[model samples]
Target: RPSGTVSCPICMDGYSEIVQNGRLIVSTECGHVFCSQCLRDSLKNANTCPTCRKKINHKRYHPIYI
Candidate 1:
């Protein structure tokens, strides 16, 4: 559904994707992709999705894996 490169809406410093390139992670609640460090800083207190304003928790943070 992306028409262009997806970046962290919060930082706007851009995102890092893993493997072939930088690392990126999608918010479990939303379709947004953000870097771990940025997301951590944002949700450290708010515990809410910065983009969609979805309610989130500490446990919501996780690595993208099987």
Candidate 2:
């Protein structure tokens, strides 16, 4: 099984039970991992990847474990 800690760039924290339950999502455009809550909040204002500033559909996010 996979091991080690993955952090959310937005919050600068390790995965939480909530985040895990929601599932970790990665930016399809930039491959950066940001928790769903942060992404949801950011995506509301702009359709772009937060870490790379690449334009996106916001709905283009995918699971981190892909």
Candidate 3:
């Protein structure tokens, strides 16, 4: 029963459900959240999170969560 508003880490503009590629994903280890598209944009140049700069999205790590 998690109760909170969803937001994009990169934009902090909350969640989206119909942006073609849209969803808010939380970091598994840090509880940091970001929009999937935003995360991809940051990850495109780096594997770590753009907000926390944690060594994430590793070859064995998945940055997206429900």
Provide C-alpha RMSD values for all models, in order.
9.0, 10.0, 9.1
**Model 3 / residue 16 / CA error / Å:** 5.2
Instruction: Give the TM-score comparing model 2 with the true structure, all chains together.
Output: 0.60
- Candidate 1 clashes: the total is 7
> Which residue pairs in candidate 2 have backbone atoms (N, alpha carbon, C) closer than 3 angstroms, thus clashing?
none
Of 2 and 3, the candidate ahead on lDDT is 2
On residues 1-66, what C-alpha lDDT tens digit does candidate 1 reach at each position? 256765666556444333225446556456666766678788777877877788776564768888
lDDT of 3 by residue, 1-66 (tens): 146866664665655542445564655355677666677787778777676777885476666977
- lDDT: the better of candidates 1 and 2: 2
TM-score for each candidate, following the candidate numbering: 0.56, 0.60, 0.57
* Error in Å for residue 43 of model 2: 0.6
Clashes of 3: 1
Model 1: colliding residue pairs = 16-22, 16-23, 17-22, 17-23, 17-24, 18-22, 18-23
lDDT tens per residue, model 2, 6-63 = 6677766567653656656554556777777787788898888888888877455767
Q: Rate the local accuracy (lDDT) of all candidates.
A: 0.63, 0.70, 0.63
